[PDB]
Amino acid sequence: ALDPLSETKCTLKSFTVEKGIYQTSNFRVQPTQSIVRFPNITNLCPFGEVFNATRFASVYAWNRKRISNCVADYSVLYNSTSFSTFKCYGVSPTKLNDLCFTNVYADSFVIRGDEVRQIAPGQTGKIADYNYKLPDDFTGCVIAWNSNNLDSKVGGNYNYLYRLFRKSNLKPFERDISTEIYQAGSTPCNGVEGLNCYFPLQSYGFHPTYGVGYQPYRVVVLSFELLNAPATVCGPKKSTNLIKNKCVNFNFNGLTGTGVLTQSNKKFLPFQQFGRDIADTTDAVRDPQT
């Protein structure tokens, strides 16, 4: 990196160079500053109302909530909660602080201890077939923790229900709350239950003195997509003033890169945020602020 002659020596892999023209690599420019551009978001995200709720939903009628206008600073949970299972699928955990999420959804329910392994793509079983299913190409995170001190009663809590019989398996992210009569044998059930007719719902029997495999667990699943579809939930990073006409390192809503920024004459439709070139490379981007 000293002189062009030294560069030619390095490229040729020798110490002596004869006479020639010896084309070198190129003209390269390094950046000077690093800039960050995040939207104007101030309110903390309602972690308490989701995780620290007074009650959850039954597994067959699982609950879904929409999350928007948040600052995803999950350090606040460090003193109040302890999670037994936490696994993400589309991202690496260490990057969760340098991204903005677009269409966040939170799913909540409660299951038995020995069934947390079934909340994963490609699994099979009672929960994975009749109650709750995940798509093959899932992008999100799964969190599960023990809740013995809350969802267990001395006489036995009979408020949480689960389905036991179904004619066919579910499709991903589908709900079923029908309470008909399941026919197992051959004689039609024609209403009332009988010898080969069953009520398809049964209640979990939760006692404070059961084994660890029979104790209740609370499960929350977070689903989102990352780059396209301009985002609304963002992580805890500080924005900096925009620098243009110079080569810099830029982080726009989680997209990182290096280059020079100039004004453009393009006009985006209201639902578009990024614009790419012919060879699938990002060349145009809107600005969160201004």
Binding site: R66, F173, E174, S178, K266, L269, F271, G275, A284
Partner: protein, 270 residues
């Protein structure tokens, strides 16, 4: 709950090179791009449904829903006002309702016990000219509701029953992974019959997280009546003029052209 249904065999037609929607939300300019997805094949069989009275044609049947659907409405007055989606259309399964009642557009997901022939109704008065939507019969009860959305209030004209059709509306409905996707488009048009050939984009409208099983759907219509024979059932109605066409989607590979301004302009069915 309705009579006076003079009948005749249904009609048929084809579709032009229309029914193309944006597949993503990324800006592209002056490009030729190849994509395989669920689309409406060019020159496809399409059924035709009338609503008029010289005949007393009303035409609100139950049609199968499979792999999404494409719905085109040609009208001069607001008659087609929503849809009902479900699997059995009974009280033992969940169902989806989208309907506009001249003040709000409402989307609901409940355990509806639907009527055999639901509709809305407007009444025309004498001397003091007015129309104040004096009829609404869509369902009997709704117990367990998980999704609900109501829009801001507004108002719309109600009679407009002169000339020929002057409004065209395009809708595409899909159901994937518990998401109900609706794409929409609007266009002024002057015609008499036989939906015009042409090309138009179908910019995304909404994605709803309903998470239900859908196999069949039915159309919601509004009839306007005035001083006529009484006895609603055989009492006359004066549904003026409207038409709706239905097509079915299939998986196909298409080629799309993105313009200089980022607008889809032409497509080719491989």
């Amino acid at each position: 709950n309705l009579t006076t249904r003079t009948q005749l065999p249904p009609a048929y037609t084809n579709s032009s090179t229309r029914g193309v929607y944006y597949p993503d939300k990324v800006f592209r300019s002056s490009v030729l791009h190849l994509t395989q997805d669920l689309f409406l094949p060019f020159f496809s069989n399409v059924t035709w449904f009338h609503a008029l009275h010289v005949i007393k044609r009303f035409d609100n049947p139950v049609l199968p829903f499979n792999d999404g659907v494409y719905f085109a409405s040609t009208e001069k007055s607001n008659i087609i006002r929503g849809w009902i989606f479900g699997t059995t259309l009974d009280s033992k399964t969940q169902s989806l309702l989208i309907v506009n009642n001249a003040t709000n557009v409402v989307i609901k997901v409940c355990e509806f016990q639907f009527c055999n022939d639901p509709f809305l109704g407007v009444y025309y008065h004498k001397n003091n000219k007015s129309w104040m939507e004096s009829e609404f019969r869509v369902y009997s009860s709704a117990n367990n509701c998980t999704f609900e959305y109501v829009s801001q209030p507004f108002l719309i004209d109600l009679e407009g029953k002169q000339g020929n059709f002057k409004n065209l509306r395009e809708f595409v409905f899909k159901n994937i992974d518990g998401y109900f996707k609706i794409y929409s488009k609007h266009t002024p048009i002057n015609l008499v019959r036989d939906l015009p050939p042409g090309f138009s984009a179908l910019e995304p409208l909404v994605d709803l997280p309903i998470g239900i099983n859908i196999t069949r759907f039915q159309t919601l219509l509004a009839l306007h009546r005035s001083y006529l024979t009484p006895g609603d059932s055989s009492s006359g109605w004066t549904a003026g003029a409207a038409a709706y066409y239905v097509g079915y989607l299939q998986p196909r590979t298409f080629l799309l052209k993105y313009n200089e301004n980022g607008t889809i302009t032409d497509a080719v069915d491989c």
